[PDB]
């Protein structure tokens, strides 16, 4: 039973993502806010991907399950088969 893995998304990792986004200066309260937003995004995608997996009577989440889940949420991903 895994626990507290959201802190593995470190402060230097969040800063690198902000730099690719063009951000020059970052307040200290950004890091907890970003972890909450990422957790909300991941829970929504994974819930639909597991729903596709359970409908197929499988026990393994495939890349196609993730691609279908992203597509129905309006965020189409190219490069993994769909």
């Amino acid at each position: 039973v895994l626990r507290d893995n959201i802190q593995g998304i470190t402060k230097p990792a969040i800063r690198r993502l902000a730099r690719r986004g063009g951000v020059k200066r970052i307040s200290g309260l950004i890091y907890e806010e970003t972890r909450g937003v990422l957790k909300v995004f991941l829970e929504n995608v994974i819930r639909d991907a597991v729903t596709y997996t359970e409908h197929a009577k499988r026990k393994t989440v495939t890349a196609m399950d993730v691609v279908y889940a992203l597509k129905r949420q309006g965020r189409t991903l190219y490069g993994f088969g769909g």
Partner: protein, 94 residues
């Protein structure tokens, strides 16, 4: 002029169950008819894609239930699944 079909007789029957002394205007009835047609195509479209992904030629009650879980949020999806399962069970028994 050809005959026009709608859900208005069924919407009125549901309204009398939940609010026996309440009516509905013709404009609001037009809103409810468009709502039912909208939700129908959303569910049937997702059920069609689910059968296509799994290489099945038949849309069953399993595909409808999965499409409901994908489309409806939270507690609405949970109660809708219970209503659909109960109706299929009663239909099967007789």
């Amino acid at each position: 002029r050809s005959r026009k079909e709608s859900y208005s007789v069924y919407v009125y029957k549901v309204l009398k169950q939940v609010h026996p002394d309440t009516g509905i205007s013709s404009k609001a009835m037009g809103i409810m008819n468009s709502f039912v047609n909208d939700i129908f195509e959303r569910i049937a479209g997702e059920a069609s894609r689910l059968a296509h992904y799994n290489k099945r030629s038949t849309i069953t009650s399993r595909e409808i239930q999965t499409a409901v879980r994908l489309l409806l949020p939270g507690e609405l999806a949970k109660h809708a699944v219970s209503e659909g399962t109960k109706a299929v069970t009663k239909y099967t028994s007789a």
